[PDB]
Symmetry: D2
Subunit: 116 residues, 4 copies
Amino acid sequence: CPLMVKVLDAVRGSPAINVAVHVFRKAADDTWEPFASGKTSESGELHGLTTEEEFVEGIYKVEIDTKSYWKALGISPFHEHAEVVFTANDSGPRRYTIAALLSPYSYSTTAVVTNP
Amino acid sequence: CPLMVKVLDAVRGSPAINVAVHVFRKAADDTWEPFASGKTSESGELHGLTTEEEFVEGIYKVEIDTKSYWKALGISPFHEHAEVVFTANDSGPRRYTIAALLSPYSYSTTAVVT
Amino acid sequence: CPLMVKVLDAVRGSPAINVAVHVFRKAADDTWEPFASGKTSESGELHGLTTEEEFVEGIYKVEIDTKSYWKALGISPFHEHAEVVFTANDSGPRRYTIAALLSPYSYSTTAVVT
Amino acid sequence: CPLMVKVLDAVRGSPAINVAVHVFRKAADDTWEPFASGKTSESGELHGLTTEEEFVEGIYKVEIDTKSYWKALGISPFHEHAEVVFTANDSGPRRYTIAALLSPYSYSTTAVVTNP
Ligand SMILES: O=C(Nc1ccc(Oc2ccc(Cl)cc2)c(Cl)c1)c1cc(I)cc(I)c1O
Ligand SMILES: O=C(Nc1ccc(Oc2ccc(Cl)cc2)c(Cl)c1)c1cc(I)cc(I)c1O
Ligand code: NA
Ligand code: NA
Ligand code: NA
Ligand code: NA
């Protein structure tokens, strides 16, 4: 599991459950190729997106569908989504955890990068 | 204006208006003594807390009454308040902006020292 | 000034100066077309991006070149940039401030809509 | 484990390891009574602070010694510490996770509250 995503809800003080997450990788022609997708669990975590073999060097985009999350709670939020774009594995394989903290008009994102 | 406080509301996407803010300075007996007070304006800002002459080296605490702010909006908050504790003017006067971004179960605070 | 961007540096406690910012608007073919551009001032602010007449309903992307900012300081960053994507003026003109707080491995963004 | 603390470093993209954390509970005379303390592990997590029996209703303060953390890294930070003050267990026992994200001139804190 070299790529994990965790999402928290700053309004309710809870994991953000059932949030859709789409991962893309920049292709040779500069377009965003679909790479993996999933949804956060009851713990707010999304595991199993990829493998060490599949998760090669590249520029990756993680798009978290925060708009659908807020709308289901009856809230009209500001952002269309929360996105994280980063170069991965440039100095060799690493494990990446992307965390996002969500409010209707704000989000914060952080990465922890570890060397296995 | 060597010390300014700005408060924003991450739920409504607005300045946080009428938020009570108390500033304390640590005294020799390690007690917090009142130093300045006010409430945020319609822009979420609190100016005129102190003067350069009064704002000397020390440890300061800025206490933002976030609980009363959320209660006024009918929202149950987690924190009793948001406190920001820092050393100021330990190398002579400086200008300090303390910004706070509020959510019911989270807050962020940053300092801009110019 | 219906759209303003402010960028702060959480490592140095300062405005983030000379940060390149590009604004795009989503077109009918779902491509991002250039809409406005600039760089933050010495106060970390970018004003004068658009006018009320030009800033119509649409989906907008504000792309902040955070990587170049950290590289200029000799600091290795995580993100390629910070993007903020939002729908604006879908109920008529509004005023929008997008603030971003930057750290090498983290950023926060908030909108104040007045 | 009804009270857990997690601390992350936003400059390095890592857990904040060996960070001292002091917990206090407001006493009947309005003073802060020492309640528990510990330090974050190699994962940035501090477990085992208290028990269900010990962690009664009250107003609690969690003080995270961010100044010593930054100074050990050669950085002179802004804050003396990061503190979180909250009423706990008012509607019955809950589990609290307090997370803090640290930068030299900024910190963010969030709570997740769950009902066991
Ligand atoms: O933020 C993080 N971790 C976390 C985990 C659990 C937390 O609290 C609960 C409690 C119960 C439930 Cl069900 C869900 C969440 C909280 Cl507040 C925070 C986190 C962020 C990054 I970048 C990297 C790693 I590696 C992390 O671990
Ligand atoms: O965060 C800051 N500044 C800011 C200013 C304006 C903003 O947007 C509006 C728009 C209309 C209104 Cl009425 C209120 C707020 C937002 Cl969001 C943020 C800020 C934080 C620090 I540390 C230091 C300085 I120096 C700052 O400026
Ligand atoms: Na390489
Ligand atoms: Na000194
Ligand atoms: Na409309
Ligand atoms: Na009760």
